[PDB]
Amino acid sequence: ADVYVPDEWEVAREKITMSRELGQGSFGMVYEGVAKGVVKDEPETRVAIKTVNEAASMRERIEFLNEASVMKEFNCHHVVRLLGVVSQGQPTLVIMELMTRGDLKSYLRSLRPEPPSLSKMIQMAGEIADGMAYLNANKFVHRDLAARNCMVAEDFTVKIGDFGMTRDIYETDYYRKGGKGLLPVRWMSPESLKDGVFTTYSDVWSFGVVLWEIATLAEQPYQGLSNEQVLRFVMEGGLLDKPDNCPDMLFELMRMCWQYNPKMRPSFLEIISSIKEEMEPGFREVSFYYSEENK
Numbered sequence: 001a002d003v004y005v006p007d008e009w010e011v012a013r014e015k016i017t018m019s020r021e022l023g024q025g026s027f028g029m030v031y032e033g034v035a036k037g038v039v040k041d042e043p044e045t046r047v048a049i050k051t052v053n054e055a056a057s058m059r060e061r062i063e064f065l066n067e068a069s070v071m072k073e074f075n076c077h078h079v080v081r082l083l084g085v086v087s088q089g090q091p092t093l094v095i096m097e098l099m100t101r102g103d104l105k106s107y108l109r110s111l112r113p114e115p116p117s118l119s120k121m122i123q124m125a126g127e128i129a130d131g132m133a134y135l136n137a138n139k140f141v142h143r144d145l146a147a148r149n150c151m152v153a154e155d156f157t158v159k160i161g162d163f164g165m166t167r168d169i170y171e172t173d174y175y176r177k178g179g180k181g182l183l184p185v186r187w188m189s190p191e192s193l194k195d196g197v198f199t200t201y202s203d204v205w206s207f208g209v210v211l212w213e214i215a216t217l218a219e220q221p222y223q224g225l226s227n228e229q230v231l232r233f234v235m236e237g238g239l240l241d242k243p244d245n246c247p248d249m250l251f252e253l254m255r256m257c258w259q260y261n262p263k264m265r266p267s268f269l270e271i272i273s274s275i276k277e278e279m280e281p282g283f284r285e286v287s288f289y290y291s292e293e294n295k
């Protein structure tokens, strides 16, 4: 077996059926399929099946497994769910909640004329903020919040995905610096760019950039600035320009998230409270915000 430390998340491979490809993932191809007994009331569930290249060592396979194991601790409607792991023998698999529409950056670019209404943009923002508020409440700091790291469900619901996970696909969204490691510099707070430290406040900064991506259909932030120019611009108080035809209140939220002083930024909870009224009816029943765990 691709033996790491198996735990209660292991699922027999005979319970998984792979139907067709979804697309290339960082460690290998991702397929859609069905898994038996991964959800309480469901005999079988439609799922996403992540695989690792046939060419891959024990270390790399264990890496793939360890990377996925962070989500074992999450249980939130607005965070993509991990459903199982096949670590015993080849091929190594990770079973996840199926999100048919792929990553949010790709979804956004697919809407290009060659877009979401303000109410639809608020809905995405609220869903993303709810997933983040849930993570921050549980002491988790994402460190790589960006549209590329959010996923879109069949019914269009947006959910938080893995830190990185979509790093080998959008390589230009990363830059090698700070201990010469790949960092998503165009999404990073000025304080993180300076000392390499990430907090819930810096996750909120990144959230502002996500709003900006949504408002521009995922253009590259700071287009026209090199990676090195970005570091200097942002560290010295520079901000992204209000997108063309961007609703005022959306840009207002961005500016709040982009306060130079991290303590001046709103919390994900505060963001949600400000748009709560605009969220579709069912938000009350599925959100972390309105849950008994939020308090």
Ligand SMILES: Cc1cc(-n2ccnc2)cc2nc(-c3c(NCc4ccccn4)cc[nH]c3=O)[nH]c12
Pocket: 022, 023, 024, 025, 026, 030, 048, 050, 080, 096, 097, 098, 099, 100, 101, 102, 103, 151, 165, 166, 169
């Ligand atoms: C890769 C991909 C492609 C998809 N697609 C093709 C055309 N339209 C959509 C859907 C999809 N859902 C997943 C899932 C995952 N792949 C992680 C990942 C890697 C690279 C890019 C994006 N996401 C994970 C969990 N659930 C998914 O449904 N991955 C995909």
